[PDB]
């Protein structure tokens, strides 16, 4: 759509490389930051989708 | 033994899988289930009532697969006094295939 069809999406980050035909619908924040990163955001803590 | 619960978080943070036999159906389903800590059913041998509870999950959000059937686990024929049955199951989760 010329407005941009942002309803199609992919994953940017993950703990580990998944197994063949596994499927991960987790919405948990990826902590690329060193320190524990409670709640929705923080320094290098990523919403993964 | 009505069945089993399986997963990696068991609390609707991820997907998880439910196997049960109730008073008629067998059901297999896989959802972000918010399971109970003490999931169970009541009969007390059906002494003054029969099946009337489902205490296993508080919610089931985006179930990616479901299947159902007639009642599995048939009882042995003819009977004998205090004779019993061995039921035996192997579960494997490999190549994305339970
Ligand atoms: C057994 O559980 C399934 C799945 O929730 C449901 O469709 C069915 O109505 C239940 N059986 C009875 C006898 O209520
Ligand atoms: C899972 O539930 C959330 C919140 O209701 C929703 O945004 C998401 O699109 C659902 N996923 C699927 C595969 O339906």
């Amino acid at each position: 759509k010329v407005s941009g069809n942002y309803n199609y999406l992919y994953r940017l980050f993950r703990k580990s490389n998944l197994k063949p035909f596994e499927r991960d619908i987790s919405t948990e924040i990826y902590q690329a930051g060193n320190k524990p990163c409670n709640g929705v955001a923080g320094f290098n803590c990523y919403f993964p989708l | 033994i009505r069945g089993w619960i399986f997963g990696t978080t068991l609390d609707s943070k991820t997907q998880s899988l439910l196997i049960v036999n109730n008073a008629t159906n067998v059901v297999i389903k896989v959802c972000e289930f918010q399971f109970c800590n003490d999931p169970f059913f009541d009969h007390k041998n059906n002494k003054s009532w029969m099946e009337s509870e489902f205490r296993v999950y508080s919610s089931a959000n985006n179930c990616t697969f479901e299947y159902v059937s007639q009642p599995f686990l048939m009882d042995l024929e003819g009977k004998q006094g205090n004779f019993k049955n061995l039921r035996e199951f192997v579960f494997k989760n490999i190549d994305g295939y339970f």
Side-chain angles (χ1 to χ4, degrees):
Chain A
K1 187 177 174 183
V2 74
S3 61
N5 195 354
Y6 301 106
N7 306 284
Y8 283 122
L9 301 103
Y10 71 96
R11 183 169 300 275
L12 185 63
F13 283 126
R14 218 276 181 181
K15 164 176 171 172
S16 59
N17 308 57
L18 55 138
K19 211 68 173 75
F21 300 128
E22 180 67 21
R23 192 163 36 37
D24 183 351
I25 67 177
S26 63
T27 58
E28 193 57 78
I29 305 304
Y30 189 88
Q31 309 93 344
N34 193 15
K35 295 177 176 176
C37 206
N38 178 277
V40 73
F43 170 93
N44 297 303
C45 308
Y46 287 88
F47 182 82
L49 308 105
Chain B
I1 308 300
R2 308 310 300 267
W4 307 271
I5 313 299
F6 300 93
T8 187
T9 58
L10 292 294
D11 71 355
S12 76
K13 293 293 302 294
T14 68
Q15 263 286 19
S16 290
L17 181 144
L18 174 62
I19 306 293
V20 212
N21 174 228
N22 71 18
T24 296
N25 311 65
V26 170
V27 53
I28 73 184
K29 189 160 178 158
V30 58
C31 318
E32 329 90 301
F33 293 108
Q34 184 59 269
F35 299 116
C36 190
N37 200 0
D38 300 4
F40 92 108
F41 292 89
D42 73 301
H43 281 265
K44 285 197 177 179
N45 309 341
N46 315 274
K47 188 172 187 287
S48 306
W49 69 112
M50 70 88 72
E51 163 30 37
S52 200
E53 289 187 6
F54 181 82
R55 295 187 177 184
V56 319
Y57 66 77
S58 62
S59 73
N61 191 172
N62 289 337
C63 304
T64 64
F65 163 81
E66 173 180 343
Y67 168 82
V68 301
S69 81
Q70 319 79 6
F72 191 75
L73 174 51
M74 74 82 71
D75 56 333
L76 81 174
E77 301 188 306
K79 302 187 176 183
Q80 185 264 32
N82 298 8
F83 221 84
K84 197 161 287 183
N85 55 94
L86 170 59
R87 301 309 309 224
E88 195 165 47
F89 292 89
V90 162
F91 312 136
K92 301 179 57 158
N93 186 3
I94 305 289
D95 80 90
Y97 243 105
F98 199 83

